[PDB]
Amino acid sequence: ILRLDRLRQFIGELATLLDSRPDESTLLAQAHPLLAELVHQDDWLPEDCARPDPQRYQQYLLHVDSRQRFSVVSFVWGPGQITPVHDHRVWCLIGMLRGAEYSQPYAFDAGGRPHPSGARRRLEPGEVEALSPRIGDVHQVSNAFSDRTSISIHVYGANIGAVRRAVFSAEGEEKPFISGYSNSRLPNIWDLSKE
Ligand SMILES: [Fe+2]
Numbered sequence: 001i002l003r004l005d006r007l008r009q010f011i012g013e014l015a016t017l018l019d020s021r022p023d024e025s026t027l028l029a030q031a032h033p034l035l036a037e038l039v040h041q042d043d044w045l046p047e048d049c050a051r052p053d054p055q056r057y058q059q060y061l062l063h064v065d066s067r068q069r070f071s072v073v074s075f076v077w078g079p080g081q082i083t084p085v086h087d088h089r090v091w092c093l094i095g096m097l098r099g100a101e102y103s104q105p106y107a108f109d110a111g112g113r114p115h116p117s118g119a120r121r122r123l124e125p126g127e128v129e130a131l132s133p134r135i136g137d138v139h140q141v142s143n144a145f146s147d148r149t150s151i152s153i154h155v156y157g158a159n160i161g162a163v164r165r166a167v168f169s170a171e172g173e174e175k176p177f178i179s180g181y182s183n184s185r186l187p188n189i190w191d192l193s194k195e
Contacts, residue, residue, distance in 0.1 A: 003044040004189045010038040011063055011072065014155070018069050024091050024157075028130045031093055031155070039095035039153050040126045045074060046187040052078035052149045058182040061161060063189070068159045073181075077101065077143035077150040084167040085114050085140045086177075090157035091132040096123040099150025103129060105139045106168075113172035114138065123152065132157075138168070 013034050017027065038044075049060035053076075060074040077099065085106050094103075100122060107117035117136065122144060123129060131137055143150045154160070161181045166174050 002046065002195075003041075004195065006038060006041075006044045007062070007072075007189055010034055011065075014070060015065060018065075024132055024134060028091060028093065028132070032128050032130065035093050035095040035153065035155060036126060036128045039097045039128070042098050042125070045097065045151070045153075046189075049074045049183065049187060050076060050149075050151060052076050053182070054078060057081045057083065059161070059179060060183045061181040061186055062153075063186070064159055069157065071156050071158065071160045073154040073156070073160060075152045075154050077152075079148055080143055080146045082142035083140060084169075085138060086167040087133075087137045087165050088131060088156065088160075089133060089137065089163055089165050090160070091130070092137075092157070093128060093130050093155040094123065095128045095153040095155070096125050097151045097153050098125055099148055100124055100144035101150055101152055102142050102144050103139055104141075105131075105136055107136070107138065108172070111172065112174075114168050114170065 014031055017030055058076040062072040062074055064071045103121040103123055104116055105118045106114040108114050161179055164176060164178055166176050168174055
C-alpha cells in the first residue's frame with residue numbers, strides 16, 4: 001500500500017537536478033518543491049522508519065546517493081523531545097511530514113556564545129525549510145507537541161551520519177559529534193514486484 005514510488009521519484013528527480021551541477025542556491029530553490037511534493041502527503045514512510053524512542057529522537061536513514069551527494073533521513077521526534085543547538089556543515093532541506101516542529105536559528109557573537117538570530121519558526125506538514133553554512137547553519141529544533149510523535153524528512157548534502165559536526169551549549173562550549181543512524185538496516189524501497 002505504501003507509495004514507495006513517490007520516494008523513488010523524489011530520489012531520482014533530486015539526483016537529476018544535482019547532475020546539472022547547480023550552485024547551492026539554485027539547488028536549494030529547485031529542490032524545495034521536490035521535497036514539498038513528497039511530504040505533502042503522508043502515505044509512503046515505512047512503519048519501521050516512523051518509530052519514536054522514549055529517551056531520544058531517532059534518525060532513520062532512508063537512502064544515500066551513490067556518490068554521497070545527498071542522504072535522505074526520517075527524523076522522528078517523540079513527544080516533547082528537543083535537540084541541542086548544533087550545525088550541519090553541508091546544505092540541508094527539512095520537510096515536515098507529520099506533527100510539527102519549532103526551529104530557532106542561532107548566530108554567535110565574537111565571544112563564541114550563541115544567540116537567536118531570527119524568529120522561532122513553526123514548521124507545519126507540507127512545509128520545507130533550508131539551511132547551509134552559507135546562509136546560516138546553526139539552530140535548535142524541538143517537537144512542537146508535548147503529546148505526539150512528529151516526523152520531518154531531512155535531505156543533506158552528504159552522508160550526514162558520517163559528517164563531523166558540533167553541538168553548542170548556551171555558554172558557547174563546542175562539542176564535536178557524529179549523529180550516526182538509528183537503523184542498522186535500510187528499507188528496501190526498490191522491490192517493485194512487491195507493489
Ligand atoms: Fe538540524
